[PDB]
Amino acid sequence: DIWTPLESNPDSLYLYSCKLGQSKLKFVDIYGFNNDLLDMIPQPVQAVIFLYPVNFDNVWFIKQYIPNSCGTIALLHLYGNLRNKFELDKDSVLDDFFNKVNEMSAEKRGQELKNNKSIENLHHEFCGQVENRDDILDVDTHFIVFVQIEGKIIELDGRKDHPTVHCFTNGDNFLYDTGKIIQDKFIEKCKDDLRFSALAVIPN
Amino acid sequence: MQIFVKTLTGKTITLEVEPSDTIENVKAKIQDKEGIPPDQQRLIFAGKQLEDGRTLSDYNIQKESTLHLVLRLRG
Ligand SMILES: [Cl-]
């Protein structure tokens, strides 16, 4: 059924995360992928959220079935894979969710998301105002996330059949290596579309 | 005067402006040029987000200054 898309807004996403049971991470705008601009992002970068025009035993994955829920799927992919480094609040919406769906397939997890009314309600507390029907019915932008897991950069998109493993990284190269990927695999492919957005996930 | 606006994709937009132009006017010029509605646009200069009601003069943005454009997109 029909959800309102989330805006790539650092404040909203942080408040949404707190309310889900994660207050230890925050979001920061990326102005560009050149070293000059990446240098200003505080370290350690834990993930990159990216909005753009539309053997993994160790990674947490969820399939997307609700077309405009992709922003929420990104936050699940983010916190589900940072669960060890940044633990969720006990008895929170996400603590409950992650425990419930831990032995489920990515498909079945995705379908438990459809039934989770707490999450749908919170998504729509923090999705940011729309003006017209097209804001909700005509969505041309995808919302995905890049994480580092066992020293590799992993792209998480619930519309795909599996996580996408990109490359190796170690130390604080993550942001810079993720930038190369983004520029090469996504931005370069798009001529004359400017509608891209990126956020760095850093400790709060 | 001329100012430049850099996007995330690395494109540079050239705009024709006066010191008396407001940040709203500048956003409207970017829409004329690129079709992006002003409400989705955030302009940064010197690491400071520029406020809609102020002028380029208020921020002492001079000739050939480069701004960064961040887009608030719905995904
Ligand atoms: Cl804002």
Strand blocks (E) in chain B = 2-6, 12-16, 41-45, 48-49, 66-71
- What residue spans of A126-165 are helical by DSSP H? 134-137
> Which stretches of chain A sit within 8 Å of chain B by CB?
5-9, 29-34, 40, 51, 70-71, 74, 128, 135, 139, 141-143, 183, 187, 190, 193-198
Residue B33: both structure tokens together: 């040029």
Domains of chain A and CATH, by start: 1-24+60-139 (1.10.418.80), 25-59+140-204 (3.30.1490.420)
What kind of experiment solved this structure?
X-ray
Contacts of A203 (CB under 8 A, 6+ apart): A24, A25, A26, A44, A46, A86
State the first-to-last Cα distance of chain A, in angstroms, to the nearest integer. Answer: 34
Q: Would you list the domain boundaries of chain B?
A: 1-75
User: Contact at 8 Å (CB) between A79 and A119?
Assistant: no
Whether residue B6 and residue A34 make contact (CB cut-off 8 A), yes or no, is no
| CB pairs < 8 Å spanning A and B | 71
Backbone dihedral angles phi then psi of residue A80, each to the nearest 5 degrees: -65, -30
- Alpha carbons A92 and A129: distance in angstroms, whole number: 26
Q: Which residues of B touch A70 (CB under 8 A)?
A: 75
What is the distance between the alpha carbons of residues A146 and A119, in angstroms, rounded to a whole number? 22
CATH topology of domain B1-75: Ubiquitin-like (UB roll) (3.10.20)
Cβ within 8 Å of residue A103, ≥6 positions away: none
Q: How far apart are the C-alpha atoms of A25 and A71, rounded to whole Å?
A: 16
The one-letter amino acid code at B9 reads T
Distance B39 CA to ligand 1 centre (A): 10
